[PDB]
Ligand binder design. Structure first.
Ligand SMILES: CC(=O)Nc1ccc(S(=O)(=O)Nc2ccc(Oc3ccc4ccccc4c3)c(C#N)c2)cc1
Length: 369
């Protein structure tokens, strides 16, 4: 029940791991293709989700039975659509998520002509992820799993900041890998999938790179922008600003778009967003009325209305309407600041919060002094 992309391009999906260690890059790629992709491809992700939610062994298996064969609307290993160079989005997941849980966003961007690299972070913020201990292990698919670390309260400030720095490093590394493939670097996918990465040679518009992320990933957008001038702009979906150091807020040259849910936000968090503002920098913010934190992630589509509200997976707003607004506003912002030659400027009003379901900026107030 994950919505198909609303753009005119058909969408393909594949996975890339290189190198095979936990210091290598692991991403899911959504791309314009020339609808059978497994949404959550391994049992360990469900076990990891169960740990994240604070439940035991049995819950893991329950989630697996429920969602284990569910797909997402992208053609698995379909050939890349040839003939044109695509803008690139690197996408960062929230705490307790992993690379496949933002396919509603990834697939919609791909359907509008983007290549999207959804990274899987190895900072121990993912519910689960894996790597291979050596080439031999990779060759027989012998995975080594890393589960989410839970932190003591005294540890939080320090570790979350180290994690967001590791996350920014992984977004940059993912960018570097894709740009190297674009220029013909041979890569041996540690996964042995029927998609040839040589397809990506000369397929990237190297001047049109953006970073997008949700929650922890929203902080990662800001840290990545600050560290990596190759990214041209950023969109932070309901950013959780806590992991960032005080020094970073004034060190974001690139245009930045905050798209917030209504019920997630709170003054301490909003204050840090406003610290990113400067008269000489491009900043936009909107809030989606009635939305909750999880409106940006795929489990907002995975259940019925009533159980969804109980689990805080759904807000007062409809999940399709909310992701539509976010995606369309994102496309307009990307067109404006990547210099895209598309018709996304039809949604320019959404950047300004000009819609019944949008608030310009935020309803939360904070000191300006
Ligand atoms: C209390 C708390 O920290 N909360 C929290 C913090 C961060 C996030 S996140 O950034 O969206 N990261 C994130 C983490 C896990 C995710 O899968 C879920 C989420 C909730 C579930 C509830 C019932 C059954 C299955 C579920 C599976 C999804 C998704 N989509 C996204 C989500 C919730």
């Amino acid at each position: 029940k994950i919505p198909r992309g609303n753009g005119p391009y058909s969408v393909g999906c594949t996975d890339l791991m290189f190198d095979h260690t936990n210091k290598g890059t692991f991403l899911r790629l959504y791309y314009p293709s020339q609808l059978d992709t497994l949404w959550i491809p391994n049992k360990e992700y469900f076990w990891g989700l169960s740990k994240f939610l604070g439940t035991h062994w049995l819950m893991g298996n329950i989630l697996r039975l429920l969602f284990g064969s569910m797909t997402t609307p992208a053609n698995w290993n379909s050939p890349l659509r040839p003939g044109e160079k695509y803008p690139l989005v690197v996408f960062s997941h929230g705490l307790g998520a992993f690379r496949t849980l933002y396919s509603a966003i990834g697939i919609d961007l791909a359907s509008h002509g983007f290549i999207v690299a959804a990274v899987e972070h190895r900072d121990r913020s993912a519910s689960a992820t894996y790597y291979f201990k050596d080439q031999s292990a990779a060759e027989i698919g012998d995975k080594s799993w890393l589960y989410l670390r839970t932190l003591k309260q005294e540890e939080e400030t320090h570790i979350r900041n180290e994690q967001v720095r590791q996350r920014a490093k992984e977004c940059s590394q993912a960018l570097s890998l894709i740009l190297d493939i674009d220029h013909g670097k041979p890569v041996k996918n540690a996964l042995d999938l029927k998609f040839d990465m040589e397809q990506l040679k000369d397929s990237i518009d190297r001047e049109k790179i953006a970073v997008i992320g949700h929650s922890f990933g929203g902080a990662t957008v800001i840290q990545t922008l600050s560290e990596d001038q190759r990214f041209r702009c950023g969109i932070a979906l309901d950013a959780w600003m806590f992991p960032l150091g005080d020094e970073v807020y004034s060190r974001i040259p690139q245009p930045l778009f905050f798209i917030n849910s209504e019920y997630f936000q709170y003054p301490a968090n909003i204050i840090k967003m406003k610290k990113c503002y400067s008269p000489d920098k491009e900043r936009k913010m909107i809030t989606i009325r009635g939305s909750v934190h999880q409106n940006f992630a795929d489990f907002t589509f995975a259940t019925g209305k009533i159980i969804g509200h109980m689990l805080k997976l759904k807000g007062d707003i409809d999940s399709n309407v909310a992701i539509d607004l976010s995606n369309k506003a994102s496309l307009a912002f990307l067109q404006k600041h990547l210099g895209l030659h598309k018709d996304f400027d039809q949604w320019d009003c959404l950047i300004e919060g000009d819609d019944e379901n949008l608030i310009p900026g935020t309803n939360i107030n904070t000191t300006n002094q």
